[PDB]
């Protein structure tokens, strides 16, 4: 029960995705999830983009877990080096129609006030409490709290290829990072069970934040671009 | 307790690597695994090169196994495209002091009349009777018959960069191909229990192999020269 989908930009209003918040496509059709004003990134934004419909990732009747692939393509600028750019961006799936979480150092998809279920690979831009240090990628199930976390040197402004594919036969998770620009490949891989922590129908989709207020620093932010995304999942059952 | 090792180029007469069969040492600083004689090819060729000194992956005593990453690349120019190039180079750790086996599509690491246990991640570009679609990068533990495998398409004479990394810790060996050329990136992961399959300690190192003069088929050839290669591994005990 194959379920894909390629986008190798983003038209104006798509109808194919749910825009929320800051969330808004660009007129040179990029997608910006976080909010960007005459050219420069403003602090207090929060943004996310899911699929409109929703996918199957596994069967109660037969049992059987999706296998899925999905490839994208991001650019983070950070026009602000001094004090620290915040907070990154996510891949995530979550329970279908869910609504935008905690900005900052929770990327939008976490509400300490009402909590859903989420697996989620972050590309962490800001140093919480609870992180390594940054930017890092990470792979976090719930929480925000990475059960796995790498570190990676950014390309400002440049472009990132990503890669992250899941096999449910061996409930591998594996996310590469590749800035075809510097060369350099980042890879992170660990054991999640979907079935375990997910619903049978989600919604996958990207979802950013920037600086938060309490923080009082305007300069704390940068953009978070999605330039293209494939997704492609194999349901057996 | 860290050992590791790199090799921007490598040096005539490099003292800590262990040459074996027709692997040599270009001029110009490659390292070529199988034979090559006035810029071309030979078919009947098998060569192994290994890390001089060997490495601890686990410690009987705390039972610990070791967390290991390397990166290297390589290139194969395939000069004639018919009837058919062979047989591929493999990254492989084994026990220490073993000879060279079995060429052709064993790559010269397995050896029927004395097997020796071995985990491998091949770069196939041969196929044998238990062979996928080639050219593949497969995951091979004691045998040449992979446990995972994955199709990729060659850049004949470019650059590959690869990027093996393994967790004790969740025991998933995940490995990226690249080649910046064409932009595209591949990626492969499987768990394997290191502590289950090899000593505590081992070698690492490539080998290769071209056409089996049984195929009689002397443009079954190409080359197989690594270009740079970096090691670390870490034993907590
Ligand atoms: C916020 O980002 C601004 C641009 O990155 C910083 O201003 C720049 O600061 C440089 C030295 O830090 C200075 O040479 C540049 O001329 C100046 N350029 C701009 C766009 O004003 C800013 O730095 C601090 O605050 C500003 C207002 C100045 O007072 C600087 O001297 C300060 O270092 C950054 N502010 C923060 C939150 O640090
Ligand atoms: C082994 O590789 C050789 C070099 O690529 C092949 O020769 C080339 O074959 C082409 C077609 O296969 C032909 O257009 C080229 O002129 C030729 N190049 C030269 C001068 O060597 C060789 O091909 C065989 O020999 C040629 C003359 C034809 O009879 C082909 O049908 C033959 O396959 C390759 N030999 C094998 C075993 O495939
Ligand atoms: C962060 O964004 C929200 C939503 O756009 C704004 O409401 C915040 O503005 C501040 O709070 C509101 C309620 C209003 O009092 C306004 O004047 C405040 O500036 C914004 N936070 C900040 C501090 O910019
Ligand atoms: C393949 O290479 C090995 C070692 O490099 C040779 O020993 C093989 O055999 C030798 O060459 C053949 C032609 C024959 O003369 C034999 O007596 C030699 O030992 C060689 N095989 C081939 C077909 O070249
Ligand atoms: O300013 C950006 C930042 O603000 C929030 O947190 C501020 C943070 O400041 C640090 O210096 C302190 O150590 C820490 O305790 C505070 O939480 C926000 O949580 C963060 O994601 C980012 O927006
Ligand atoms: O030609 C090079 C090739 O030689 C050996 O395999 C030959 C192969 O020929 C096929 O036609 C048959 O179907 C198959 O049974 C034979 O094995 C060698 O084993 C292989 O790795 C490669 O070098
Ligand atoms: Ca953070
Ligand atoms: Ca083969
Ligand atoms: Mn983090
Ligand atoms: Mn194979």
């Given at each position: 029960k194959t379920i894909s989908f390629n986008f190798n930009q983003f038209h104006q209003n798509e109808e194919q995705l749910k825009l929320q918040r800051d969330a808004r496509i660009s007129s040179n059709s990029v997608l910006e999830l976080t909010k960007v004003v005459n050219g420069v990134p403003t602090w207090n934004s929060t943004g996310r983009a899911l699929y409109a419909k929703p996918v199957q990732v596994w069967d109660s009747t037969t049992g059987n877990v999706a296998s899925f692939e999905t490839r994208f393509s991001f650019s983070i600028r950070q026009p602000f080096p001094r004090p620290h750019p915040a907070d990154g961006l996510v891949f995530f799936i979550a329970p279908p129609n869910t609504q935008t979480g905690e900005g900052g150092g929770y990327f939008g998809i976490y509400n300490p006030l009402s909590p859903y279920p989420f697996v989620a690979v972050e590309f962490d831009t800001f140093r919480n409490t609870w992180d390594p240090q940054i930017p890092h990628i990470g792979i976090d199930v719930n929480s925000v709290i990475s059960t796995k976390t790498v570190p990676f040197t950014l390309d400002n402004g440049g472009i990132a290829n990503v890669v992250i594919k899941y096999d449910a036969s061996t409930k591998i998770l594996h996310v590469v990072l590749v800035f075809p620009s510097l060369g350099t490949i980042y890879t992170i891989a660990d054991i999640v069970d979907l079935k375990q922590v997910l619903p049978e129908s989600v919604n996958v989709?990207?979802?950013?934040?920037?600086?938060?207020?309490?923080?009082?620093?305007?300069?704390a932010t940068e953009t978070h671009d999605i330039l293209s995304w494939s997704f492609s999942a194999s349901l057996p059952g």
């Open positions: 989709g990207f979802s950013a934040a920037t600086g938060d207020p309490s923080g009082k620093q305007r300069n």
